[PDB]
Every structure is written in structure tokens, then in C-alpha cells.
Design a protein around this ligand. Structure first.
Ligand SMILES: CCCCCCCCO[C@@H]1O[C@H](CO)[C@@H](O)[C@H](O)[C@H]1O
Lengths: 48, 149
């Protein structure tokens, strides 16, 4: 029914490993860039 | 430029304005002032300079007379080694849209008086140079940034 059965799951292994690696790395890079805004503080100082 | 220091050297002594806080000016005492003078205005940390039609020997003589007695302890001789100031890759944005024109200052950390690289950094700074709309040179100025400006 599906001769690709063996290679399909072999790919599924490679996929899951790569995907796990890349998702983590991209999460850091996102957090790294967004760190500027995430930590940013602001004040309201008129000549009141 | 005060804001620049306030964020570049944030959390250190260099982050403070020369004039000081409003609260400090409000509440500074004669004791506090006299303390500063006695603590800082000390002979080894002072330089009597002169320039003109002045004989150097006559200068050190009048200096020898009015610049006074020797310090007693070793503490009063030694020149203080200031604690280091930490640079911070950071920004401070004080926004006021009612303000006519905007001011922007951007800087990296320098080397210090001792470093011979300070000469090259002045050569580099000379390349870019400076400009304001009264520079008669106009579009023909050698400075690329000025020409684009
Ligand atoms: C973000 C998604 C990344 C998925 C990466 C999948 C890489 C699959 O790579 C494939 O693996 C097969 C199994 O060995 C091989 O037969 C193929 O030649 C190879 O191209």
C-alpha cells in the first residue's frame, strides 16, 4: 500500500531532530531581538 | 549630551550632570561645600599654569610663597584612583513633539586620555567633520556626510 513506509519514518526522524533544533534557535533570536522592548521602561515627566 | 552620559555610563559616577540634582542644590550645606573643597582641592591634584610675558622662575617663587604647607600623612599625598565606569549599549528617548527640532546623539566607548589611538580617532572624526546651514561651502564641502546633508 505504501512502499515509502520505511523512508517516510526515516524522514520523520530527521525532521523532528532538525525542527527541534531550529525552533529553539529561532526562539532565542526572537527573544534576543525583542529583549529591547521586553525590558524597556518609560516615565511621564512633564514640566508640571 | 547630559542624557547621553546618563545612559552610556548608566549606574556610574559619569552618568551624573555637572550641575547636580535639584534636591541636592536645594539641600547642600556649608559643611558639604567646605567638605568638597578640603577633600578635592589638594596640592598634588592641582596645577598652577601660566602663559604670557612671565618668567617661570618668578612664577614658581610667588607660587612657593602662597601655595602652602606640606601635607602630613601619606593619605593627603596620594592621588585617588577613581572606580571604573561601565559603558552600556543602551538608549534614552525623551520625546516632545511640541519641540521644534529634534536632537540625536549616538556614541561608542572611547579609549581614554592615555591611549595613542585617541589621535587616530581625531583624524577619523576630522574626515566626517561638521556642518550647520551657515557653512558657505554648501554642496561642495569635502565632508561626505556634509555633502549628503
Ligand atoms: C524544518 C523541516 C526540516 C526537515 C528536514 C528533513 C530532511 C530529510 O532529508 C531526507 O532524508 C531522507 C531519509 O534519510 C533521505 O532519504 C533523503 O535523501 C533526504 O533528503
Amino acid at each position: 500500500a505504501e512502499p515509502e513506509h520505511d523512508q517516510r519514518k526515516r524522514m520523520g526522524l530527521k525532521m523532528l531532530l532538525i525542527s527541534a533544533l531550529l525552533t529553539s534557535l529561532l526562539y532565542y533570536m526572537k527573544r534576543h531581538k525583542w529583549s529591547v522592548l521586553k525590558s524597556r521602561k518609560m516615565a511621564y515627566r512633564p514640566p508640571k | 549630551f547630559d542624557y547621553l552620559h546618563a545612559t552610556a555610563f548608566q549606574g556610574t559616577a559619569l552618568a551624573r550632570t555637572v550641575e547636580g540634582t535639584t534636591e541636592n542644590i536645594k539641600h547642600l550645606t556649608r559643611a558639604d561645600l567646605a567638605s568638597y573643597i578640603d577633600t578635592h582641592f589638594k596640592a598634588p591634584r592641582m596645577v598652577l599654569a601660566a602663559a604670557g610675558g612671565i618668567s617661570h622662575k618668578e612664577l614658581v617663587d610667588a607660587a612657593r610663597q602662597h601655595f602652602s604647607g606640606v601635607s602630613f600623612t601619606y593619605k593627603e599625598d596620594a592621588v585617588p584612583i577613581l572606580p571604573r565606569c561601565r559603558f552600556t549599549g543602551s538608549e534614552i528617548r525623551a520625546r516632545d513633539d511640541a519641540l521644534p527640532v529634534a536632537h540625536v546623539a549616538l556614541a561608542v566607548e572611547g579609549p581614554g586620555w592615555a591611549d595613542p589611538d585617541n589621535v587616530v580617532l581625531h583624524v577619523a572624526n576630522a574626515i566626517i567633520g561638521r556642518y550647520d546651514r551657515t557653512f558657505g561651502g554648501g554642496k561642495h564641502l569635502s565632508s561626505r556626510l556634509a555633502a549628503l546633508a
